[PDB]
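Re-run requested by the PI after the first attempt was lost when the workstation crashed. Everything re-entered from the original request form. Ligand of interest: zinc ion.
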Amino acid sequence: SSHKTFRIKRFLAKKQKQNRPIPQWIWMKTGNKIRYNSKRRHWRRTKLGL
Amino acid sequence: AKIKARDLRGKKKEELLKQLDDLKVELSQLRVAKVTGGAASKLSKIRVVRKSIARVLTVINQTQKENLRKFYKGKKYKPLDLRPKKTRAMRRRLNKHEESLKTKKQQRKERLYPLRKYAVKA
Amino acid sequence: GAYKYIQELWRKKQSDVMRFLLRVRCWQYRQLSALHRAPRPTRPDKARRLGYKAKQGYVIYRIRVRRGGRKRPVPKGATYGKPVHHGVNQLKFARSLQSVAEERAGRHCGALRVLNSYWVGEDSTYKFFEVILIDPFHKAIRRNPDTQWITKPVHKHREMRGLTSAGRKSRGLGKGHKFHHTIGGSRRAAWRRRNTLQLHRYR
Amino acid sequence: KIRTSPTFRRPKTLRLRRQPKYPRKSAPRRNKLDHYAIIKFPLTTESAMKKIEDNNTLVFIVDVKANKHQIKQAVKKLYDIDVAKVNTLIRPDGEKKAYVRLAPDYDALDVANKIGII
Amino acid sequence: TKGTSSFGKRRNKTHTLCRRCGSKAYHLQKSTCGKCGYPAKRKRKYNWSAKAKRRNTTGTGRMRHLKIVYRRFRHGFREGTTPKPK
Amino acid sequence: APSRNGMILKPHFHKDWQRRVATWFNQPARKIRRRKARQARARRIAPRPAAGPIRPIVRCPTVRYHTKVRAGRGFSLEELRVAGIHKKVARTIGISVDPRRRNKS
RNA sequence: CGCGACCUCAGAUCAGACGUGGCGACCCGCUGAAUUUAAGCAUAUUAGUCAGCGGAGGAAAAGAAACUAACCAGGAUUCCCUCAGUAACGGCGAGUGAACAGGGAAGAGCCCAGCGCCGAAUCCCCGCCCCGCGGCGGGGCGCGGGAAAUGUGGCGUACGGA
Ligand SMILES: [Zn+2]
């Protein structure tokens, strides 16, 4: 929808920013257990709700 | 320099604003230097200025408040900021003195018949 | 004094003097709203027995309660079950109408607290009660050592727990062999105590 | 006195203003949207420069709560210039991009060197 | 045609985001939330779903004001005092 | 289904009794709590006796127990009047007083 | 009609304060089933139970007899043992089912209306003084305002009281 409200566009802004992968150096840490981002949302598979 | 809180309290209120906006000014090109690709040494300095701005603005917020509550120290009515905020249930209770109020009938009882200290034998 | 002569004056409700007055107040109270404030007691003698004192902080509200029993709020019969619970017309509410008047007065004026209530008139469809309310934050009530028990947070909404004089009648509590099923805290406490297994360590 | 109209209206009773014996809050809240917080950082995008030498404008990242009037006075106060017009948009990333058109007596290239972007 | 061909006409959202509970359960036509009951002053909760209770209780969120009441409780809620300076 | 020989039993377990089950694991901890509060009370009234005020000599009702003698709620006003002790002063010196008791004997 | 009390009833972004909502393991007041059993099932039983509603507190409620008893009598409320699976209720079927007394834990009593006596002897707010002021507290001054005679305060509550 080209027509948007300020609530939806602000809400869509966070989900776009959360779709980026983890940094390269994050598994150089000491007690880190994260291998990759398990919350990567693809626009074809996961439809985000709404 | 390492801005401390001890020496900031004795300075003038308008002198703090003279220092505050310069810290605000000096932080402005630091965000510019991040976008333009500045040196990594200057990118580690911006957290110090953020905490130094927080230090300056705290003292301005601090020193204003004890001037206000000293001004309202003797008055009957004070703003709700200066009133003690502690757990609304007990702000609705009585004062220190009011449950110490005994009736004239009750005060006669302990004077006429006080509780006695006594002991018994075997 | 004069308070005694009004005590048995209200005990003669069938007399000509009271029957004229009771039908005038009932007409007057009917044209008003279902909830409004009375500025002074119509029954000054009754309020003193219940604990009202004519000072600042003592507030009384006069309301009405619709007369009759309680029918079951169900769609057209809506009793999907055994014939025992098929009764819908001749059911009765567990609490009295006076206790309902204490609940409605306390729910509206939530800042005040209900002391007691009394009867001032009735109709075919309405019962009229004056309900005494106490302001727990007025300095006359707050600084008086006799009346500061209202100010404690334990006595919030006494009429909601049935702790008032009218609400205590429907609880069925009291001393004697007629109140065996309310021994303990309440009716619920008696059933709870009698329906538990005291499984000891050594049995 | 006589009643000309058959309807009864409530008489206009006098009402006072607020005369508090104490303010509700001790001190007024300080302005958190100052001239420094409103302008975050300018853009060094190849489209951002392309907006500069051609249109004689400036591109900034500004807070989402800002007005076009507030951006006009902010750029005026911070850099000692004046602004012809301001066009704003909200990028899907989440903060607000504003195009600041400068007056023809000022040059977008020269003011860029004082503020460091090139 | 009650199956696959009937899902193609789904383009009108009936629910939307609530601004008190955060869940997408605010019915536009009834102007009410099916999760928390937005127009009602009281939060919608029921005892027949204990799992739905513990999804949103006093322990789930930030407790940005309640976590300092517990810290201040163990000192008796002292006010106006400061530790002895150097 | 009953067996050959046995009793007819009425187990009162047809309600949801498993919810209302009162275990007694607090009993060893309760006894310590009763003792510690009792010892703390005694130190508060250190010259006064730990039991409290004295109790009168009381015959039992319910003829099954009518030959037994217990310790009662409090001394009657007739018993205090003969002893020459004012009823409002006896309570301060550790005498249990109640106005409900009678004196038939 | 002018002028002035009083009673009812309004308007306030009036001065000063109060309630809303959350949690809800425990508690109080309502409302309140059907699965199940009775080898069916309808009274019963499940069960004042689940669910629903309101209200608090750190505990709540109850509580100092219009009591229990018929004894040579006990003597506020609450909890444990026992009474007792008893008296009793129940298509007297399934099943349901207390209370007194006794031994313990604890143990604290009291206040009004009315009856009357005291010159309203009473209380709230606003201003001033003094002293602490994060619980504005007390005392003193108010031909300062108000509440209160449609009854405040002291003595005084069944054990008697003046
Ligand atoms: Zn919602």
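Saved to the shared folder this time. Residues E 18, 20-21, 23, 25-26, 33, 35-36, 38 surround zinc ion (CB under 6 Å).
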